[PDB]
C-alpha cells in the first residue's frame, strides 16, 4: 500500500523512505522443484502412435 498523502510505500503499517522495489534474483529466476512439475503449463501427454 501507498500513503495517499506523502506518496510513500507502507510496509506492515510503517512508511519507508525511498523508492520501494520488489526484490528478485538474477533476471527473475526461480529454483526448479520436482521433475513432474516441469509439465505445469506444458501440453498434455502425446497420444498413442498410429501403427
Amino acid at each position: 500500500p501507498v500513503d495517499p498523502v506523502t506518496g510513500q510505500t507502507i510496509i506492515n503499517g510503517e512508511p519507508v523512505v525511498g523508492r520501494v522495489f520488489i526484490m528478485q534474483k538474477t533476471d527473475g529466476t526461480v529454483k526448479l522443484g520436482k521433475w513432474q512439475a516441469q509439465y505445469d503449463g506444458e501440453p498434455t501427454a502425446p497420444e498413442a502412435a498410429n501403427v
Binding site: 526461480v30 526448479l32 502412435a49
Partner: protein, 335 residues
Amino acid sequence: MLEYQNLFTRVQVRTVPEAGIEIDESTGTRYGTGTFSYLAGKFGDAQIGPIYLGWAGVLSLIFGFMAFEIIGLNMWASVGWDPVEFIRQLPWLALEPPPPQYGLRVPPLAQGGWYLMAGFFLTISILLWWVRVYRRARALNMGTHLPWAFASAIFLYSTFFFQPLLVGSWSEMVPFGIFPHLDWTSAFSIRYGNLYYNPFHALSIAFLYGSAVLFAMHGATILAVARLGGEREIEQITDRGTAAERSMLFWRWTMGFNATMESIHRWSWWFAVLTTFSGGIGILLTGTVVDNWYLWGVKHGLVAPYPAQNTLTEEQQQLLRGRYQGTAPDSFPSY
C-alpha cells in the same frame, strides 16, 4: 638460436635389425626381418621390424576381414554397385541395423541380417585380438596391464550390443558408417533426453579431458628433462637420477603435490581406463533405468533455471499435444 627442443632427430644411427627376444614359436612365428624408414626415424624409431603371427592373430584377421568385407559389399550394393558413387558417397553409406518391429528375432537378409553377421564377426575378431595381446604380453614375461586396458575399451564397445538387447531390439544398434554412426550418436542423445545430463557421460568426459591433460603434462615433462636422460624411464624408476628428481620438484613447486616416475603411468593408465569404463556404465543405464536424463537431472537438482520463453493457454496445452511417432504409410492415397 633456440635451444634443442627434442622435437625431431637430425642424426640417425643405423645397425643390424633387432630380431627380437627369444620367445616360444610352437604355435606362431615372426614374419619379416626388419626394415628402416628414414621419415619414421625422424620422429621416433626407424625399424619397421618383424611382426609375430600365431593362432589368435590369424583367426582374428580372418574374422575381421570377413566383417570388413560384408560391410563394404553392403555399402557398395547400396549405391547400385557404382564405383564412382561408392567413392564419392563413401562417408554417407552405411550397413543399417534391422527394423524395430523384429525386436530380437532374426531379420531378413537385406533388412539387417548382414548387419548382425558383420557385428558378430567383428566381435569375435576383437575378442581374438584381446587373446593375442594377452599372449604377446605373457610371452615376454611382462605384466598384463595392456590386456586389461583393452578390456575396458571392449567393455564400452560391448555396451553397444548389450543396451539394445536390454531395451529389446536390434534396431537400436550403431550402424556401420562414417557419417551414419555420428547420426546415431546424435539421435541417441536426443531420444533419451540430452545425454549431457547422464552423470556417467559427464564422468567419462572428465576422464577423457584428463587423459589429454595428463599426456600433455607427462610428454612436456619428459621432453623438458630429456637432456638429462629422462626418456629412459625404466632406469629412472629402478635408479632415480636427476631427471626424475627435477620432474618431481617441478610439479611439487607448481601445484603443491607430485607423483613419481613410475606412478605417473599409474595415473595415466587409470584415467584412460576409466574413460571407457564409466562411459559403458552410462550407456548401460540408458533406456533401462533412465529414459530421460534431463528429467533425472531435474529430479536430482542438476538443471539451472532459465526464464520461461513462452506461456501456453488452456486450449493451447490441449492443442499442442502431439502424437508419438508410428509407422510409415504403406499406401499412396488418392484424394
